[PDB]
Amino acid sequence: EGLIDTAVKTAETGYIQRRLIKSMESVMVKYDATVRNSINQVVQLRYGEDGLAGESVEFQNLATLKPSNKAFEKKFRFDYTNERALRRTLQEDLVKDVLSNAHIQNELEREFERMREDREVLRVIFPTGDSKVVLPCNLLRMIWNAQKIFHINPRLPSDLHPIKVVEGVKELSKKLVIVNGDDPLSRQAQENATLLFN
Amino acid sequence: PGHINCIRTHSTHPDDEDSGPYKHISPGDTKVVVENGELIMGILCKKSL
Amino acid sequence: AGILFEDIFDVKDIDPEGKKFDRVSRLHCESESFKMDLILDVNIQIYPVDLGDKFRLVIASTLYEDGTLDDGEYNPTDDRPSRADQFEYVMYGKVYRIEGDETSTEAATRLSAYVSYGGLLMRLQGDANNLHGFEVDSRVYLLMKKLAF
Amino acid sequence: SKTYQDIQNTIKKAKQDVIEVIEKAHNNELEPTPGNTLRQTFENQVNRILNDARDKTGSSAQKSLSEYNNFKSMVVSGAKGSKINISQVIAVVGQQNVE
Amino acid sequence: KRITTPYMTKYERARVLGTRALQIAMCAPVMVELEGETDPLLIAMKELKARKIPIIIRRYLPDGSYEDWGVDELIISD
Amino acid sequence: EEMASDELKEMRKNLTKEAIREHQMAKTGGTQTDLFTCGKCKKKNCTYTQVTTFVVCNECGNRWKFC
Amino acid sequence: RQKLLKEQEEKRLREKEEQKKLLEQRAQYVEKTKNILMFT
Amino acid sequence: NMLTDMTLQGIEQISKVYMHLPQTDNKKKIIITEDGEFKALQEWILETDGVSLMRVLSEKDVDPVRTTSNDIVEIFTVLGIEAVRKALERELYHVISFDGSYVNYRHLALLCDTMTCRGHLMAITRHGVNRQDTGPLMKCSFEETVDVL
Amino acid sequence: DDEEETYRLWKIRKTIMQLCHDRGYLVTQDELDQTLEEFKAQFGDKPSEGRPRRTDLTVLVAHNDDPTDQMFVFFPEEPKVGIKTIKVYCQRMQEENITRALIVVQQGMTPSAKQSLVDMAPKYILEQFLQQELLINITEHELVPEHVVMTKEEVTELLARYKLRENQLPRIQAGDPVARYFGIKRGQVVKIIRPSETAGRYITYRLVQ
Known part of the structure; x- marks a missing residue:
């Protein structure tokens, strides 16, 4: 049987494999960054709906998708009220900022609301609770590289101010541009194309 | 090369090892850990190479 | 100085999991003045030990008795005063984890410093004050030596 | 030899179990599995018994192999072969299917 | 108002390097110091790193418009 | 059916119950175990089969393998 | 708390909008049932 | 004819209907709990050896949201070209991943997009890709060589 | 009955x-x-x-x-x-x-x-x-994404942002079940908002022809 199927798999499968290529030979990614064909009919507006080359993406996990509505809160919320807890992670000056500055506190709350909305989004994108996703940057390995390059020692209290995280990520979301433009249609499609990575 | 970081489980890694103790000090030297481009732990196999 | 930790120890089990390797055995050992715990892999082929073997274990930051930091390269050809000269089994390794019972509010009471000696693992576990000399990703030397008692 | 004795005992039990399933079918005592014909029920029962036999024997074989065994070392590296090859070489080649 | 990616794609990099190396092999004046090499592809690669390749890249958009991009303006990737 | 003899009612009930039992799909066999924790639902109700260990969670239907 | 109250009463206005659109739609259905009649 | 042809029950194409309780999680029902957990439910699902998708979806107590046809042509007539894109993508992914292998989604999305780009199911055949208005020198490269020329 | x-x-x-x-x-x-x-x-x-x-x-x-x-x-x-x-x-x-x-x-x-x-x-x-x-309602089916009929004003803006002739968009035929559901007619364009596993959301446009 294996010797027969070896021979048989040869003939058909290659036919399967020419027809595909002839159907798709000229489909390519234009400088518009859209995926068109010979006659220039637009097949995809962005390559793969995201505009990213297939090599550079990896297997990551969506942290917010799985967890319960309570383990999500105690993990993505950054309570500012536990002064004792803050002085553990944050230095003695950052805590008094976080402990006192109403703008800091409300900005952190706004961030948590944004994560909560992203969570509901993810749960409409990935029902069945499938945390495993394919995305360009390996964030957890970049973080781990950061811990190993600057010698973090995750046991001393850190000097990274929370809102420097918030605003740094906000500003980073600006530089990961897939659909270039300031037009509402282009800001919308940039927001969509970089929605899961964001 | 460089400072790679990755974690892998050697093919024989017993699945009940990450639950009990010895989680980070594996009896059978499964659990490949590379840190700063340094093989700290674990046997390498197809799962890691 | 660079002496990070020292205690009397004794071996209280070897390979409780069964002998996973032929030249390497898990030692499960207890300290005596601090009653910390140790899980150490020794090259049981060139340095055999048995249950109830008592030993000094001096985990040190550097071999040199003047405490000058080594560069971490193997050189031989060296006169300098070296702690190794008064031990029997010396290993060199990378502290790769420091777990502990940290809570969200108040610090760990106990730490488990994990060290990899080129792949031979050690976990030293006990009250944190004896482990304050350990920080993750730091070079250390094992310098153990059996007490004839 | 203890491993071979275990393998042979397992196969003997599996052969006896298949004989008993045949007896159950011959006497019309074998109630069909839902959806299956009685023949499909019988064939599923026998295939399950014999797959379980081949698997149990393959495991008992693998469980016998020392860390020195050079099939084990090529398998657990993933370099060549697989646990089913160790099984077929040591324990039992198993059911030969066509189509 | 150039809207294309500001990065030199790997196709533009392959073609630019081969074309410039051809021009060098035809005794074109080099735009970079030769520390003593003679392969036209090695020179073309050095010029690429120096961003001194005297070539602009006309990227056609699917509407049939085009954009011209120097080889010092866009960000060379590798 | 409601006017039938008690014997004929019980016969019809038995035939209906047997027809339902015959049309029930066989539950896929395997060794039930609590050794495996499901990565999706975190429950321990799993079934395994060795051929490589294939594992199925009986609660969420998640499937995975060990080599 | 005051912001919550004003949001609540805004939601009540948004309900009233649908209520009055329904009253509109029934208002034209009274005219149009006549049309259905003369048609049917 | 009445014996063979007169339908007492069912619908003419549904030659037989199985009845399974799903064991995987991919034909299970998934329901976000009140607490946010996912909690895959195990609900009875039917299957068939024939297809009559629109009539089946119409049935009471059939789920019209989830019921699907394993037949890209049927789904085209009932659910239209974009549902065809999704269905075809899922069937193709099913055949590819069934053996445990994995292919990036870009290549599946791209194939299913080319096959659905013109609003009908564009077969990947002379009958399908030469109907496309690509231009004669491209169609002769494939099939019907001189006929297209 | x-x-x-x-x-x-x-x-x-x-x-x-x-x-x-x-x-x-x-x-x-x-x-x-x-x-x-x-x-x-x-x-x-x-x-x-x-x-x-x-x-x-x-x-x-x-x-x-x-x-x-x-x-x-x-x-x-x-x-x-x-x-x-x-x-x-x-x-x-x-x-x-x-x-x-x-x-x-x-x-x-x-x-x-x-x-x-x-x-x-x-x-x-x-x-x-x-x-x-x-x-x-076929639009209730999990396979049918959210179709939206674009207005002529914004169809023109779509063709203008991409610099794209209406002839080069993907097509949907007017007899398509969802086209008939929305009652669209030739030359009209439907916006389609798909969940995307690689991007999270994808908006694609299909011209009725």
Whole structure:
């Protein structure tokens, strides 16, 4: 049987494999960054709906998708009220900022609301609770590289101010541009194309 | 090369090892850990190479 | 100085999991003045030990008795005063984890410093004050030596 | 030899179990599995018994192999072969299917 | 108002390097110091790193418009 | 059916119950175990089969393998 | 708390909008049932 | 004819209907709990050896949201070209991943997009890709060589 | 069975309401959400000759964005309507400026009836569904993403941002089930918002042709 199927798999499968290529030979990614064909009919507006080359993406996990509505809160919320807890992670000056500055506190709350909305989004994108996703940057390995390059020692209290995280990520979301433009249609499609990575 | 970081489980890694103790000090030297481009732990196999 | 930790120890089990390797055995050992715990892999082929073997274990930051930091390269050809000269089994390794019972509010009471000696693992576990000399990703030397008692 | 004795005992039990399933079918005592014909029920029962036999024997074989065994070392590296090859070489080649 | 990616794609990099190396092999004046090499592809690669390749890249958009991009303006990737 | 003899009612009930039992799909066999924790639902109700260990969670239907 | 109250009463206005659109739609259905009649 | 042809029950194409309780999680029902957990439910699902998708979806107590046809042509007539894109993508992914292998989604999305780009199911055949208005020198490269020329 | 017919007609009516409101033909929520119970109560569970009878099951209804844009929805008395039969309705339509008429034909039109339909259509755009197709809202299906009909103003902006001729967009054929659901016509463009596993969301456009 294996010797027969070896021979048989040869003939058909290659036919399967020419027809595909002839159907798709000229489909390519234009400088518009859209995926068109010979006659220039637009097949995809962005390559793969995201505009990213297939090599550079990896297997990551969506942290917010799985967890319960309570383990999500105690993990993505950054309570500012536990002064004792803050002085553990944050230095003695950052805590008094976080402990006192109403703008800091409300900005952190706004961030948590944004994560909560992203969570509901993810749960409409990935029902069945499938945390495993394919995305360009390996964030957890970049973080781990950061811990190993600057010698973090995750046991001393850190000097990274929370809102420097918030605003740094906000500003980073600006530089990961897939659909270039300031037009509402282009800001919308940039927001969509970089929605899961964001 | 460089400072790679990755974690892998050697093919024989017993699945009940990450639950009990010895989680980070594996009896059978499964659990490949590379840190700063340094093989700290674990046997390498197809799962890691 | 660079002496990070020292205690009397004794071996209280070897390979409780069964002998996973032929030249390497898990030692499960207890300290005596601090009653910390140790899980150490020794090259049981060139340095055999048995249950109830008592030993000094001096985990040190550097071999040199003047405490000058080594560069971490193997050189031989060296006169300098070296702690190794008064031990029997010396290993060199990378502290790769420091777990502990940290809570969200108040610090760990106990730490488990994990060290990899080129792949031979050690976990030293006990009250944190004896482990304050350990920080993750730091070079250390094992310098153990059996007490004839 | 203890491993071979275990393998042979397992196969003997599996052969006896298949004989008993045949007896159950011959006497019309074998109630069909839902959806299956009685023949499909019988064939599923026998295939399950014999797959379980081949698997149990393959495991008992693998469980016998020392860390020195050079099939084990090529398998657990993933370099060549697989646990089913160790099984077929040591324990039992198993059911030969066509189509 | 150039809207294309500001990065030199790997196709533009392959073609630019081969074309410039051809021009060098035809005794074109080099735009970079030769520390003593003679392969036209090695020179073309050095010029690429120096961003001194005297070539602009006309990227056609699917509407049939085009954009011209120097080889010092866009960000060379590798 | 409601006017039938008690014997004929019980016969019809038995035939209906047997027809339902015959049309029930066989539950896929395997060794039930609590050794495996499901990565999706975190429950321990799993079934395994060795051929490589294939594992199925009986609660969420998640499937995975060990080599 | 005051912001919550004003949001609540805004939601009540948004309900009233649908209520009055329904009253509109029934208002034209009274005219149009006549049309259905003369048609049917 | 009445014996063979007169339908007492069912619908003419549904030659037989199985009845399974799903064991995987991919034909299970998934329901976000009140607490946010996912909690895959195990609900009875039917299957068939024939297809009559629109009539089946119409049935009471059939789920019209989830019921699907394993037949890209049927789904085209009932659910239209974009549902065809999704269905075809899922069937193709099913055949590819069934053996445990994995292919990036870009290549599946791209194939299913080319096959659905013109609003009908564009077969990947002379009958399908030469109907496309690509231009004669491209169609002769494939099939019907001189006929297209 | 008047009972099963009652269920069918209710299900159709609800689906029709959803179709309308997705077109933006205004439906009250209490009509759009109708359960079978208020259906039965209103129509008396007697389709053939009671109050659910198909021509009195009609509605005369208006678009939400233009209350003068009005559709007279007819379940025909004739399961297979004819020219005469559609024509008389158009006769009584003609008394009013109303034009649209979604026809919920059971068997579909006689092809002659279909011709009379398309003849009067450009003045009174009567349009046909087979009630079978209305037992289910296909846009409810998990495979059917969110279609949205673009306005001509924003179709032009779409073609202008990408610098893209309407000839180069993907196509959807006007007979497509969802195209018919939305009632779109040739040269119109539908926005389609898909969940995407690589991007999270993908908006694609299909021109009706």
